[PDB]
Amino acid sequence: VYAWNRKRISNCVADYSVLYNLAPFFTFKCYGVSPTKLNDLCFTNVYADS
Amino acid sequence: YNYLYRLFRKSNLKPFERDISTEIYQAGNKPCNGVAGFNCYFPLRSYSFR
């Protein structure tokens, strides 16, 4: 928690609907954007944290 | 939390389609049956009266 890994998703077409179908991935609701169609809409500079 | 509000619904609603009967979100093979489990939300939360 005190030292997050630095990694980002770039030039990818990674599907997020397979994650939604997966039972472990239980949080998919989105406050300001589309909850289920997040992957379909285009975006840039996605950063990841652990 | 006497002033309940429906933050989550099935999808977007047309005008005059107000939320009267509470139908919680279903995102699995089994319908939400009496449990506020993961990916299943209830409108029962404080309305920020503090």
Side-chain angles (χ1 to χ4, degrees):
Chain A
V1 288
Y2 68 92
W4 301 280
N5 46 3
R6 287 190 74 84
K7 189 47 203 160
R8 76 159 276 206
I9 299 102
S10 62
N11 51 70
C12 288
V13 287
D15 200 27
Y16 298 156
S17 299
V18 293
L19 317 179
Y20 303 155
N21 205 330
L22 280 186
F25 280 65
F26 58 94
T27 47
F28 89 106
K29 53 93 175 179
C30 301
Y31 269 92
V33 291
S34 179
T36 183
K37 220 173 171 276
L38 171 76
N39 53 354
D40 278 317
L41 274 74
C42 284
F43 41 77
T44 178
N45 211 54
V46 162
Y47 180 60
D49 286 284
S50 292
Chain B
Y1 69 113
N2 52 352
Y3 282 178
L4 281 80
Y5 81 106
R6 198 92 42 88
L7 181 64
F8 283 166
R9 204 180 172 266
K10 281 78 67 179
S11 80
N12 303 320
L13 60 87
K14 265 76 70 172
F16 301 129
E17 286 190 350
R18 317 161 164 173
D19 304 355
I20 302 300
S21 53
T22 292
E23 288 281 328
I24 52 180
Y25 189 66
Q26 323 294 323
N29 302 321
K30 63 91 176 179
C32 287
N33 184 21
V35 296
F38 285 157
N39 211 2
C40 192
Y41 183 57
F42 278 46
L44 299 155
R45 188 216 318 180
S46 192
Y47 199 73
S48 307
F49 280 11
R50 291 177 296 280

